């Protein structure tokens, strides 16, 4: 039917009944329904009053020559009879999430873990047409049939955060494809594919090269802070960057060793740890500088990389 589109396993329907909603780019069907029983429609109020809506022809767009609003059969009057309201097609939010959550859109992901991805979106036009998904390689070729896993290319409204194929959303197994940057294309089934009704979600595939670390400088003096970046890690998980206490100056104290790593960037906690307990920057309760053996700073990652910093001050000249 119309308004319950998946109830009949149909990707679209253009049999409009009285009082339903119609979108900008539709192409009404002149068969049985409100396309042959009442092909001429006129506006009711607001900017749409007086303006006519020809259902036998495709409906124009960009809110010109067809103002948004309720449409009568009589126009602005005393009749509330076969009826159409004109909305705008919209895609609001859309994300790519792993089998256990975690947005990975616009961020590089490991080829090994890119085997149970999901695509979800929210769209305004659910009564009229479903929205298609089309995966495109960087060369620009439709690889959808190779990577499709289920749900039949149709993603339902809502269903954002659905990590299972039971809910709305299509799963893509992008593990077999090579490394590169890929674009997922969402657009309406038949007609609603123009601006604000379509969205391109990008995705980067690259080898699971071991976690990459780089420094803005290699030759520095004491006191000069150095920013270190962690690269190519799984989003939402906590890495640990360690500091060997042998490189520390011998005349350092307990409080002097807990400030080697700064809270700059995505760093979560800083302190010094041992094989049994840890001494964080919150309090001087755990191991002391002579008691402890490692200096650490647990750091998360948001996107493809995270940035931290170090204090080269009080470090051995080596």
């Amino acid at each position: 039917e119309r308004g319950n589109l998946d109830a009949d396993s149909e990707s679209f329907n253009k049999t409009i009944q009285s009082g339903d909603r119609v979108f900008l780019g539709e192409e009404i069907s002149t068969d049985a329904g409100l396309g042959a029983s009442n092909p001429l429609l006129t506006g009711t109020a607001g900017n749409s009053e007086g303006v006519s809506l020809d259902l036998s022809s495709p409906i124009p767009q960009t809110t010109e020559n067809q103002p948004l609003g309720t449409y009568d059969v009589d126009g602005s009057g005393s009749a509330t009879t076969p009826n159409v309201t004109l909305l705008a097609p919209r895609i609001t939010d859309s994300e790519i999430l792993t089998s256990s959550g975690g947005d990975v859109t616009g961020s590089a992901i490991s080829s090994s873990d890119a085997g149970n991805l999901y695509v979800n979106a929210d769209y305004n036009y659910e009564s009229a047409e479903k929205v298609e998904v089309t995966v495109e390689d960087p060369s620009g070729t439709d690889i959808t049939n190779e990577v499709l896993s289920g749900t039949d290319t149709f993603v339902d409204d809502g269903s954002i955060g659905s990590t299972s194929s039971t809910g709305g959303g299509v799963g893509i197994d992008m593990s077999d494809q090579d490394a590169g940057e890929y674009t997922i294309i969402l657009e309406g089934a038949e007609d609603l594919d123009f601006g604000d009704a379509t969205e391109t979600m990008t995705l980067t595939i690259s080898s699971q090269d071991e976690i990459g670390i780089e420094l803005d400088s290699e030759s520095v003096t004491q006191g000069t802070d150095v920013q270190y970046t962690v690269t190519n890690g799984i989003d939402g998980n906590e890495h640990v960057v360690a500091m060997d206490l042998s490189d520390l100056q011998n005349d350092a104290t307990t409080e002097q060793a807990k400030e080697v790593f700064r809270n700059i960037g995505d760093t979560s906690e800083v302190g010094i740890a041992n094989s049994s307990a840890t001494n964080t920057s919150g309090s001087s309760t755990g191991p002391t500088v002579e008691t402890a053996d490692i200096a650490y700073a647990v750091v998360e990652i948001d996107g493809a990389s995270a940035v931290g910093g170090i204090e080269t001050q009080y470090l051995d000249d080596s």
Binding site: A179, D209, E210
Partner: protein, 158 residues
């Protein structure tokens, strides 16, 4: 040389076996050269050196040492493999060949002239679990893509 043959529109798969191809295109297939660069020529016993080389078509590579017999695996450490970048080049930090634990390193401890080679992940435990854990013989090492170079170890004097 490998050829590709296209056929006219509307032809069936079974009926296309005999009809000549409308056009064609040919390409050549070889195997990429995976070679080592730095562990070559001379080596002071007990010293540390980096692993430098290239690998056109590889994901995991292993280093083996041979002397009058089997290619004993050298336990480089983490996962016994080195990844390759987009530039078809793989590298490792400074590693002491004799210092590291394993029976492979024991061959290089004694002074003499030996052989060292690298091999791609085509071994994969010569069939089995996804890990390089064997001592491949001459036939097994040569069968896959690999390369070896002569190395000799010299004594260390302060």
């Amino acid at each position: 040389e490998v050829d590709l043959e296209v056929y006219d529109a509307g032809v069936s798969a079974t009926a296309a076996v005999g009809q000549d191809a409308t056009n064609d295109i040919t390409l050549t297939i070889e195997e990429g050269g995976t070679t080592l660069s730095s562990p070559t020529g001379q080596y002071v016993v007990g010293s540390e050196v980096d692993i430098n080389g290239t690998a056109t078509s590889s994901d995991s590579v292993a280093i083996y040492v041979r002397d009058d017999g089997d290619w004993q695996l050298l336990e480089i450490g983490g996962d016994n493999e080195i990844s390759v970048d987009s530039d078809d080049t793989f590298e490792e930090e400074d590693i002491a060949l004799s210092g590291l634990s394993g029976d492979g390193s024991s061959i290089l401890s004694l002074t003499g002239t030996y052989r060292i080679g690298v091999i791609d992940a085509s071994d994969a435990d010569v069939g089995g679990d996804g890990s390089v854990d064997d001592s491949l013989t001459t036939s097994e090492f040569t069968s896959g893509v690999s390369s070896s170079n002569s190395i000799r170890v010299t004594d260390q004097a302060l």
